[PDB]
Specification:
Chain D: One of its GO terms (molecular function) is 5S rRNA binding. The structure is cut from a larger assembly and holds chains A, B, C, D and E. Chain A is built from three helices and seven strands; from the N terminus they run E-E-H-E-E-H-H-E-E-E. In chain A, a hairpin with a 4-residue loop joins strand 5 and strand 6. Chain C is an alpha+beta fold. Chain C has one domain: Ribosomal Protein L30, Chain: A, CATH 3.30.1390.20. Chain C is built from two helices and three strands, in the order E-H-E-H-E. Classes of the chains: A alpha/beta, B mainly beta, C alpha+beta, D alpha+beta, E alpha+beta. At the A-E interface, strand 6 of A face loops of E. Chain E binds four RNA strands through helix 1, strand 4 and helix 2.
RNA sequence: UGCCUGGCGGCCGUAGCGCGGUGGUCCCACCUGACCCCAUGCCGAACUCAGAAGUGAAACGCCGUAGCGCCGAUGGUAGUGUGGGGUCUCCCCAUGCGAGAGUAGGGAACUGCCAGGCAU
RNA sequence: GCUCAACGGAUAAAAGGUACUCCGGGGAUAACAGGCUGAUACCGCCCAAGAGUUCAUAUCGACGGCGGUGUUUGGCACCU
RNA sequence: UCCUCCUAAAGAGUAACGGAGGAGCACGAAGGUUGGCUAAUCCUGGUCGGACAUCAGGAGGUUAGUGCAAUGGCAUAAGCC
RNA sequence: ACUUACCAACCCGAUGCAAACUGCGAAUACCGGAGAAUGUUAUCACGGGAGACACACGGCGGGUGCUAACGUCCGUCGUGAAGAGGGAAACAACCCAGACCGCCAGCUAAGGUCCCAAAGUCAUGGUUAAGUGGGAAACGAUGUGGGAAGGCCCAGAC
């Protein structure tokens, strides 16, 4: 079990998403299966420590998003390209 | 031999754009090859200059197997 | 229909030629000139092109 | 390259010409057993008249469907249907078939009946 | 000393060096030396640094070099009242953007490889870090 | 009204290439023959004419298959117009526009006029 | 009918020397000193393979790297 | 002096003693038109015949050709007979 | 005829680079049409009279040079040139701003408010101990503040 909290995003785009990495969050997306894609945001430090462990990428994860649990796999991950950080994670629904 | 040399600029390119209304005779595009081809009411010259054969608004489009850019015309 | 007020805040010394036109198009002249214009889409777009040097009181 | 594609390649320049002219065209299609003929509009989709050696009015009369004396009967038939519907000027599209023998004999029988080309 | 075998053109524009790197991931090996700043490795630099890390592992291991010096660079000789054409090609460079991986190693442990890439880093003009491979 | 074939199109790889299966009453293809029309820089191979004993093998058409092609979001990233700022070879802030690659995914085209054949 | 190719073509027809020189001008433009720059030059530091019987750093220091000074050869043509 | 590419900032134009190359002609067919045709290269077999010559077949798909630089074109060929 | 630890075309997979590579491709700009509002007709044509054809610096996009120069050559915008006033100590070209004249009135711009010198020794909360501020790199170093995890610990840790 790897639990994550989130929030749905009000804003989006370059200006909005750069303000998130100023505030120690970062943006990600949940797509896949049937539904509309969902835009979410995550505490950076939480999910940095989790993705250290290589079970992050094998296992099924559990994103809480306004009460509703969702079960998702880590499909893709953009890193910031020298400092050890994260700029975005794609979460396919399983 | 060293460098130092270039030719004079031949002021090619599109002259009248789509929408623009023309008089028969008007050149629409000068060009070296046929980047554009002639459709309806349009002549390929001998240097592949394309010109109106009728008065009307210029229309660009793509057509055929190879996706070639045709200039044609809508006679008003 | 419904008028708005537009005031020139900063000078147009040393602006682009495009922006100096846009001010003449609003009918603004000097600093702190206030001017009454109808509110359309097309006026709102002038105001956006020179936002930095104007200011809008509905 | 099979024979059908090579014949279309032959035909294609004639036909692109006849678009920009904006012409009504008498298309012909020869086969070893038969011969067909259509008159096709200036736009290039919709057909105005047809004749062939399958359609039974013409097949009853003939000895054999795919020879010169058949084609002379079909070239006769298309003119007499086209002149009813007010079509004098056409342009004879030989469709990649040499102007000669059977296709020639179709066209010369359409000139007899007064269809102008 | 690295240098293409043949090119189209002897001489090249100066260009600029903006933006971030392609070639950010450690693909070939386990560890790697990522650049953090932004400049040019000459070909002599790239070699000096290979000879450091090669010496330092005692030839265990395998080393990959991910960057290649393919821009040429001219200098005028001393006294040349400007003009009279572009200079001769003295030497070659790769351009480096923040995030390019430069060297990769595997077939050694993370004790030794940290020390090898420290000894390389002292020969290069740009600020660098050590990186391990990520699984995705 | 349905099924099948031919011709002329629109459309231009979501439409193609391969792989497997299938069609001959008509149609189509190969096919039979050549003194005559015509033809080969040699050759009835092609083109052409006169035909209808044989065959759907090849070709063509139809059906199936996600092997290769092909199309392809959302988000993020890159870039950049205007205004502002820096530690000013290069970046950051407000704001407007916003790729390419890739990911999910889609996909074994769709559509018109005329002719003929079989079924009802 | 012109390699009138100095190719909008001064004439059909034309090369040198001056330290014996002269006039008009220019700091629009050079030599000398100044200025900006610092490739070069000089001085320093970082890495440390190796030399030093043994031992990298007593003394040296390959392959490379970062600076200072404005001192040399330059570059620029801002001053005269 | 002229032509082509880049520099040139996705209309045109745009400098340097900036980076690369060409021309100062040829052709009564290498022009016109009607009809037809489709390339390089490699593999297999075959008298003299060899890595390389005429013959046959297959793969391949313009990697070819376009009188001559370069660029843009070209299968409806602007290529070949 | 046989073995090969030697170079290894093509194809296959992963991976970079390009002013003169492109099966992709913006922002801007440019051409055209329609529609308000605004601007002393600012557009175009024809006549009379010129000057000028040595430009400079600043920002952005590039060539050249050493991504040297208050260097040089293009593109585009600005200012100076031909522009005073305030700021940047002093400082054509930077920031603010366009002087018809007068006033011993007022409000603001950039930039400022301890004294020289007009205005806060203003308020609230942190940082620095180096006069850092008030000149500079690789590299060095138990300087000091904040943040998020990790290991070890009354079974006695450093």
């Amino acid at each position: 079990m790897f639990t994550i909290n989130a929030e749905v995003r009000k804003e989006q785009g370059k200006g909005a998403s750069r303000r998130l990495r100023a505030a120690n969050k970062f943006p990600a997306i949940i797509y896949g299966g049937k539904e509309a894609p969902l835009a979410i945001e995550l505490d950076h430090d939480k999910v940095m420590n989790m993705q250290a462990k290589a079970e992050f990428y094998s296992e099924v994860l559990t994103i809480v998003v306004d009460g509703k649990e969702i079960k998702v796999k880590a499909q893709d991950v953009q890193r910031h390209p020298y400092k050890p950080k994260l700029q975005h994670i794609d979460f396919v629904r399983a | 031999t060293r460098n130092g040399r270039d030719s004079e600029a031949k002021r090619l390119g599109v002259k009248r754009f789509g929408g623009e209304s023309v008089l028969a005779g008007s050149i629409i595009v000068r060009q070296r090859g046929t980047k554009f081809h002639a459709g309806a009411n349009v002549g390929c010259g001998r240097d592949h200059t394309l010109f109106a054969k009728a008065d009307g608004k210029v229309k660009f489009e793509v057509k055929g197997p190879k996706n070639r850019k045709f200039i044609s015309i809508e006679a008003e | 229909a419904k008028t708005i007020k537009i005031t020139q805040t900063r000078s147009a010394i040393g602006r682009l030629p495009k922006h100096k036109a846009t001010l003449l198009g609003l009918g603004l002249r000097r600093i702190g000139h206030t001017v009454e214009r109808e509110d359309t889409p097309a006026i709102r777009g002038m105001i956006n092109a020179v936002s930095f040097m104007v200011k809008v009181e509905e | 390259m099979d024979k059908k594609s090579a014949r279309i390649r032959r035909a294609t320049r004639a036909r692109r010409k006849l678009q920009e002219l904006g012409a009504t065209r008498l298309v012909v299609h020869r086969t070893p057993r038969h011969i067909y003929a259509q008159v096709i509009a200036p736009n290039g989709s919709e057909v105005l008249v047809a004749a062939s050696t399958v359609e039974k009015a013409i097949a009853e009369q003939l000895k054999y469907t795919g020879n010169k004396d058949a084609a002379a009967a079909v070239g006769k038939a298309v003119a007499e249907r086209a002149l009813e519907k007010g079509i004098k000027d056409v342009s004879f599209d030989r469709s990649g078939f040499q102007y000669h023998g059977r296709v020639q004999a179709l066209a010369d029988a359409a000139r007899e009946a007064g269809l102008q080309f | 000393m690295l240098q293409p075998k043949r090119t189209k053109f002897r001489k090249m524009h100066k260009g600029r060096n903006r933006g971030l790197a392609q070639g950010t991931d450690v693909s070939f090996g386990s560890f790697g030396l990522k650049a953090v700043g932004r400049g040019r490795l000459t070909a002599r630099q790239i070699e000096a640094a290979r000879r450091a890390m090669t010496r330092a592992v005692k030839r265990q291991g395998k080393i990959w070099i991910r960057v290649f010096p393919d821009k040429p660079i001219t200098e005028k000789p001393l006294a040349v009242r400007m003009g009279k054409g572009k200079g001769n090609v003295e030497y070659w460079v790769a351009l480096i953007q923040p995030g390019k991986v430069l060297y990769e190693m595997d077939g050694v442990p993370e004790e030794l490889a940290r020390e090898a890439f420290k000894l390389a880093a002292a020969k290069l003009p740009i600020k660098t870090t050590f990186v391990t491979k990520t699984v995705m």
